[PDB]
Amino acid sequence: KTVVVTTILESPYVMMKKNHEMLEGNERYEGYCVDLAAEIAKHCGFKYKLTIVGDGKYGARDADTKIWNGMVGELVYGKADIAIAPLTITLVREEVIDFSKPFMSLGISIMIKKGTPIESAEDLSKQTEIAYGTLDSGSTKEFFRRSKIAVFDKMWTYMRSAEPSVFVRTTAEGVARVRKSKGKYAYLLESTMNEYIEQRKPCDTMKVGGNLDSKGYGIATPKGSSLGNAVNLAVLKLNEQGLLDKLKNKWWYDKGEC
Amino acid sequence: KTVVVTTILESPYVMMKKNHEMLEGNERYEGYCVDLAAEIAKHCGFKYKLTIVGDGKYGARDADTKIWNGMVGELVYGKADIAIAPLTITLVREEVIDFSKPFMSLGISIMIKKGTPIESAEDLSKQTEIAYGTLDSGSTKEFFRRSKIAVFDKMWTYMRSAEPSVFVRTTAEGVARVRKSKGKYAYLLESTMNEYIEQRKPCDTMKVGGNLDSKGYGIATPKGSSLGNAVNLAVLKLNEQGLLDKLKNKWWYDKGEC
Ligand SMILES: CCc1sc(C(=O)O)c(-c2ccc(-c3c(C(=O)O)sc(CC)c3C#N)cc2)c1C#N
Ligand SMILES: N[C@@H](CCC(=O)O)C(=O)O
Ligand SMILES: N[C@@H](CCC(=O)O)C(=O)O
Numbered sequence: 138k139t140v141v142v143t144t145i146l147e148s149p150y151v152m153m154k155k156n157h158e159m160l161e162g163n164e165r166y167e168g169y170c171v172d173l174a175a176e177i178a179k180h181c182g183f184k185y186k187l188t189i190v191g192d193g194k195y196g197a198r199d200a201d202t203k204i205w206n207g208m209v210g211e212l213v214y215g216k217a218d219i220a221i222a223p224l225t226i227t228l229v230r231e232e233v234i235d236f237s238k239p240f241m242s243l244g245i246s247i248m249i250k251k252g253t254p255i256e257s258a259e260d261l262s263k264q265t266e267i268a269y270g271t272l273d274s275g276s277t278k279e280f281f282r283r284s285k286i287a288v289f290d291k292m293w294t295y296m297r298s299a300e301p302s303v304f305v306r307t308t309a310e311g312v313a314r315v316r317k318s319k320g321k322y323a324y325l326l327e328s329t330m331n332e333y334i335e336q337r338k339p340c341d342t343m344k345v346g347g348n349l350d351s352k353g354y355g356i357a358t359p360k361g362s363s364l365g366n367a368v369n370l371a372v373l374k375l376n377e378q379g380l381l382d383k384l385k386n387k388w389w390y391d392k393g394e395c
Numbered sequence: 396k397t398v399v400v401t402t403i404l405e406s407p408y409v410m411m412k413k414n415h416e417m418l419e420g421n422e423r424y425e426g427y428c429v430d431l432a433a434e435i436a437k438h439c440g441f442k443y444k445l446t447i448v449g450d451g452k453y454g455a456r457d458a459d460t461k462i463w464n465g466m467v468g469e470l471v472y473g474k475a476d477i478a479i480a481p482l483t484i485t486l487v488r489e490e491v492i493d494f495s496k497p498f499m500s501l502g503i504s505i506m507i508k509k510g511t512p513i514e515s516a517e518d519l520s521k522q523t524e525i526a527y528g529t530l531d532s533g534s535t536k537e538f539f540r541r542s543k544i545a546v547f548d549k550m551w552t553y554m555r556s557a558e559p560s561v562f563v564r565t566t567a568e569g570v571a572r573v574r575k576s577k578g579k580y581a582y583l584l585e586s587t588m589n590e591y592i593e594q595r596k597p598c599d600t601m602k603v604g605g606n607l608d609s610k611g612y613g614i615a616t617p618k619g620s621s622l623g624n625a626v627n628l629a630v631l632k633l634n635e636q637g638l639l640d641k642l643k644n645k646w647w648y649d650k651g652e653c
């Protein structure tokens with residue numbers, strides 16, 4: 138059967154083509170994950186349909202309802218067959234879905250408006266003037282919620298209680314907030330997205346300091362799926378054949394505007 | 396059943412303690428993988444015995460007999476239950492053993508004696524004054540053997556035919572060759588090992604250039620091992636608790652002496 142792929146509109150992973158209204162099906166979209174999906178499909182020998190996740194979220198479990206939302210929910214509830222997206226491999230997710238070996242490494246990082254007097258997480262934690270926050274429903278928020286590290290625990294205590302809310306619905310919303318806030322908001326997001334935006338006009342943001350953690354994005358499938366083995370082997374093959382490095386360069390740096 | 400762990404004497408992952416002569420069993424050893432094994436053993440609820448791989452190799456398949464050597468062989472032939480080592484996750488290996496999600500990232504890199512006029516793989520490939528090689532029976536050799544990237548293809552043509560042989564039996568041999576060759580030998584090895592050595596007396600080596608690729612080390616088990624699921628889940632747990640980061644700091648830069 139045609140494989141339903143869940144993914145997310147997150148630049149430069151998946152983006153609407155300029156002329157998408159004139160195009161159909163998989164041809165409407167472009168990006169790193171669009172190129173990657175085509176290759177995974179070709180190597181595993183399946184036909185597929187790209188679908189954008191309905192609720193626009195990565196995936197988290199409701200503490201009260203126990204229901205998973207986002208791409209993770211679409212796999213868990215059988216709405217999609219595979220997720221090919223910047224979907225972070227985490228323990229709580231690996232308990233309900235399967236991940237390939239990672240196709241990209243990343244860590245949480247700090248985005249500032251250029252000139253913001255912050256160099257580190259410690260810096261953010263030791264001051265009050267500059268607000269800071271995360272994507273409201275992903276792995277970055279969870280990192281802080283769970284961290285027993287002093288600096289990060291202090292940051293979480295501030296973020297969970299800050300008013301108005303320092304959390305954002307989408308990555309684009311976080312980036313826009315840094316850009317419009319005259320240095321008074323810094324955004325905590327994955328190094329991959331941080332480094333992409335740093336190379337986009339109007340070239341007014343910067344990644345500062347080291348990454349806070351180390352993790353990976355993986356291709357996810359419902360637990361027990363017949364696709365998992367082949368998908369994993371394809372990721373390894375594509376890495377070893379240099380495709381992943383090629384795709385990174387194509388979408389990050391070949392298209393740099395700064 | 397006490398779990399037989401295969402591993403390899405490779406700094407700073409597994410090393411004999413200074414006073415190892417007076418110690419028995421697992422107590423003889425220390426290092427990142429020693430600490431990791433103890434942590435994994437704790438979470439998965441098993442007792443274990445650390446055993447150094449008999450042939451001192453990571454693992455490769457003989458093209459003629461198709462027999463695997465090294466730690467990979469120990470798993471394949473049922474001589475060990477798990478490998479907890481700086482064992483590179485590769486397609487050919489994944490076809491015969493199982494790997495956890497990676498516990499560490501690395502890439503191939505260049506070690507020179509300080510002052511060697513080499514900045515990149517491209518620099519190495521464009522001269523013959525300075526010899527260069529890799530470890531036998533590991534993933535770095537295979538990388539060059541298979542590469543279609545012009546620079547790396549050219550380097551392999553040289554390496555495979557070079558006389559006397561540029562290949563070494565152990566990392567320690569490669570490092571010693573760099574240190575004694577007065578700038579006329581450069582060694583190709585994983586960034587992790589390169590960066591450790593750079594921070595050790597006599598402080599006469601350097602990592603130069605970027606990494607040539609991006610991959611990871613995983614904990615390996617025989618295909619269909621019951622330990623596989625649990626060990627994978629343990630690695631992710633350790634990562635998120637910051638324990639892996641803690642271990643990396645403990646063994647690389649807390650032990651820095653340069
Ligand atoms: C326990 C969770 C952690 S920790 C950690 C780390 O960097 O320490 C990583 C990590 C992420 C990615 C790579 C990697 C590749 C790339 O860096 O692009 S490529 C490729 C083969 C396909 C990779 C593997 N294996 C390696 C390690 C990780 C995960 N997942
Ligand atoms: N990649 C993250 C989303 C981005 C973030 O949390 O910063 C996830 O899978 O949840
Ligand atoms: N980590 C490598 C060994 C070292 C190397 O090849 O540079 C392996 O698993 O084969």
Ligand SMILES: [Zn+2]
Pocket residue numbers: 434437438
């Ligand atoms: Zn523990």
Ligand SMILES: [Zn+2]
Pocket residue numbers: 457458459460
């Ligand atoms: Zn032979």
